[PDB]
């Protein structure tokens, strides 16, 4: 309109009486010129305080975004206007907004060396850490230009909220920690002996807390210097849902300490039933051993916790049923992942199976090497006393065969019968198999109960190959 633009060149040519008037003959206080500049932005850049006020009074948008995201009190900060600074400050300005490339009044200030505008800007709660596009916060704008005394004053501010933080958490003040980590603190600190807010929050009982920094990227697994995380000091103290959430945030369930424990030692220990029924639903391992040698089970055992022990006891006994399955069945993912909740892997079932024969004797070669790596019995009898190579002979399986003989397999051992793996291979034509055997020493005189060598056993089935390579040995 004809008389917005009069408004506009009135604020900014500073004739107070000219802005009056239009505004009582019907004017709009938030007109916007074509870069987005209200009479407010103007009266602001060109210092008009008492225009400041006028426009303030008739319900100018003390808020007003250009089409940049400038607002009067950017313009107000960058020219370095003290006075027209808490004016808008005092009428509900916006301290910490951000333009397009992310600049705040701020950083403005502090980077050209506006002292008092900083100070005020901070005692009007303005955010420290914010950082531009350039991931330049105040404080590096300041460093970089020339402003030692505004840098030295951001640090200061920076270090001060960290302890401010860390006492928070500590003491339970969720409204005061929302304010600092609102103000620029950072989530992340810590003390002298690693305790980060999280710690704090977590040792102390403060759900609200634990829930904000978390909300706020806290790192949920912080190590402090013996290796705690918040998940060991919920599970000591025994807050059910801190340790729920911090579960639910991605937790580590099986960290340890330097000492070797984990956070279903101490719950086991101090008799937090529902945190060990929470934690072993999530994947917690029930035979991890501390440096004492003590498990979760003893802790409870030791300390008289029978409700937890007989839960522990029947997870044990129920990772000793579904690793013997996922043998025979032959799931890798499965067999891999039980293991690792500390399932026993010398386990056994009636007849004296363990989990290597089964793997042995179904044929499933890739679950053969997860349960060699880590530690199985290679010379493992049955009630009949048979091992996983009398199985793999059975078969016929090549490449099983291999793998077991590297780890040492007994190739003299025999079952109750008197029947070691060369009568087998012998027997159920298995050619390849004879020859790998007589390559680790493979005796040929041993006869069965029956009395009957191998060689006595190959001609009486009629292999062709394999009776002319055992007379040869």
């Known amino acids: 309109s004809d008389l917005g633009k009069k408004l506009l060149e009135a604020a900014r040519a500073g004739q107070d009486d000219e802005v009056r008037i239009l505004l009582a003959n019907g004017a709009d206080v938030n007109t916007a010129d074509e870069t987005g500049f209200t009479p407010l932005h103007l009266a602001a850049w060109e210092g008009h305080l008492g225009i400041v006020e006028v426009l303030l009074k008739n319900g100018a948008d003390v808020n007003a975004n250009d089409e940049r995201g400038h607002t009067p009190l950017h313009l107000a900060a960058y020219t370095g206007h003290l006075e027209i600074v808490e004016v808008l400050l005092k ?3 916006g301290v910490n907004a951000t333009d397009v490339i992310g600049t705040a009044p701020l950083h403005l200030a502090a980077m050209w060396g506006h002292l008092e505008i900083v100070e005020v800007l901070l005692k009007n709660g303005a955010a420290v850490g914010a950082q531009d596009k350039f991931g330049k916060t105040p404080k590096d704008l300041a460093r970089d230009n020339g402003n030692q005394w505004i840098y030295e004053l951001l640090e200061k501010a920076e270090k001060d909220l960290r302890r401010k933080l860390l006492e928070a958490a500590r003491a339970g003040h969720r409204e005061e920690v929302e304010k600092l980590i609102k103000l620029g603190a950072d989530v992340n600190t810590a003390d002298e002996t690693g305790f980060t807010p999280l710690h704090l929050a977590a040792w102390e009982g403060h759900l609200g807390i634990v829930e904000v920094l978390l909300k706020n990227g806290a790192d949920v697994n912080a190590n402090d210097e013996r290796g705690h995380t918040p ?15 911090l579960l639910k945030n991605g937790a580590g369930v099986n960290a340890t300490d330097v000492i070797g424990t984990a956070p279903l030692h101490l719950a086991a220990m101090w008799g937090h039933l529902e945190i060990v029924e929470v934690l072993l639903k999530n994947g917690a391992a029930v035979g991890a051993q501390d440096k004492f040698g003590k498990t979760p089970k003893d802790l409870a055992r030791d300390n008289g916790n029978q409700w937890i022990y007989e839960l522990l006891e029947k997870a044990e006994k129920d990772l000793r049923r579904k690793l013997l399955e996922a043998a025979r069945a032959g799931h890798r993912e499965e067999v891999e992942k039980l293991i690792k909740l500390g399932a026993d892997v010398n386990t056994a079932d009636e007849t004296g199976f363990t989990p290597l024969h089964l793997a042995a004797w179904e ?28 199985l793999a002979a059975y078969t016929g399986h090549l490449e099983i065969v291999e793998v077991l003989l590297k780890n040492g397999a007994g190739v003299n051992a025999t079952d109750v019968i008197g029947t070691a793996p060369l009568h087998l291979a012998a027997m159920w034509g298995h050619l390849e198999i004879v020859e790998v055997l007589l390559k680790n020493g493979a005796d040929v005189n041993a006869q069965d109960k029956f009395g009957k060598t191998p060689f006595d056993l190959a001609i009486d089935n009629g292999n062709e190959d394999i009776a002319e390579v055992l007379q040869k040995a």
Do not use: F, M, Q, S
């Open 363 to 390: 044929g499933h070669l890739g679950i053969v090497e997860v349960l060699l790596k880590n530690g199985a019995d290679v010379n493992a009898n049955d009630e009949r006393g048979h091992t996983p190579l009398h």
């Open 91 to 93: 009428n509900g300005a």
């Open 231 to 245: 998940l060991h000091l919920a599970a000591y103290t025994g807050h059910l849902e801190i340790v729920e959430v």
